[PDB]
Amino acid sequence: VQADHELFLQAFEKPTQIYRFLRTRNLIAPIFLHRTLTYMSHRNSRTNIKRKTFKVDDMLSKVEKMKGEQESAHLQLTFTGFFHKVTLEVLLVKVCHKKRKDVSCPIRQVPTGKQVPLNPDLNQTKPSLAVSSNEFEPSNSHMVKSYSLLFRFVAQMTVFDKNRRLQLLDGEYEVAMQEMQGPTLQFTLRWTGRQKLRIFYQFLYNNNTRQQTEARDDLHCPWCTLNCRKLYSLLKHLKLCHSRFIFNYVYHPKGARIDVSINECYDFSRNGPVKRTPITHILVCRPKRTKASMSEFLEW
Amino acid sequence: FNLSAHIESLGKGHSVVFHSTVIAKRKEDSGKIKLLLHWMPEDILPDVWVNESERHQLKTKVVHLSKLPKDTALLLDPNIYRTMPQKRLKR
């Protein structure tokens, strides 16, 4: 009844969750490149032509030329007023590169220091000067990840990104401030120098159909959205990357009926070395098309 | 924000959808106005300076998971990548 249907749902829910989770993980941190699977050849556009003629030596000339066609001064900030409905300290935040030991990117704070008017009336104006020395360098690029300005209600703004490009240009600024419409800080900054297949997935439990479905994106894996491009590739993908299930394909000229069922045969300390009983296994061994072996240096 | 639910609704099963907020504005010495857009989810995408006209068609940004900055993409979950073991006796 509803108790059996919930057991069906429960059976399919556990592997679906795993596969949908791995879809996220492996899209960022892969186990292997899908373009390298033999049943996924179509995935890779490119070929191995360049290689035979590629000369590693010629890279310098090409790189030196790219650099030749690519892109000092004090930074002064004048504060006009803080808007709300005050003491303003500016800092130079140096976020440094993480070294092996470090838990995270070390933050180095350099104080710059002043009193700025609260809700200053324009047409009633009668100033606050806070300049920054050339603490930035293309020399300490191996140490400092990025440079940023801290205003303190608080607000932050990067001066140079990771790829080290000046993004705080000369002009009239207005930044939004935050607790611990909207409090604002107003300043002036200057640098003073093709045919749809019908693919049905029938979910079987107790070896009889309990849920009949139809794929919306026909040759995409329903679990991980991989666009296999051929039915051949989709069936290999399913059977190998989703082995927690048994897939039973049934051919149709208009598409396919894939029967999904639960595979009931699915199945060190990390602290110091651990003794083991030597064991060898040969997972794959296939004769190569072109014989590459260095037979000249072979003993008898 | 549940990553799984988000990717399944907004993300079409493979992408993260970001929303911008104007956190700063500047008026150059030349007749041009630029805005500083801050992305939400935060701390994954960097702040980008954008033309006052360009605010629209940049209110949202859909990034495919394989296109997310890999250094910062791990902030999305404790088990995307982990150092096993974290604590090392030897090199």
Partner: peptide
């Protein structure tokens, strides 16, 4: 028409 496979599987996660 039948429910879509991708929606069935999504249902299964969000539970």
């Amino acid at each position: 028409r039948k429910p879509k496979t991708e929606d069935f599987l999504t249902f299964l996660c969000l539970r």
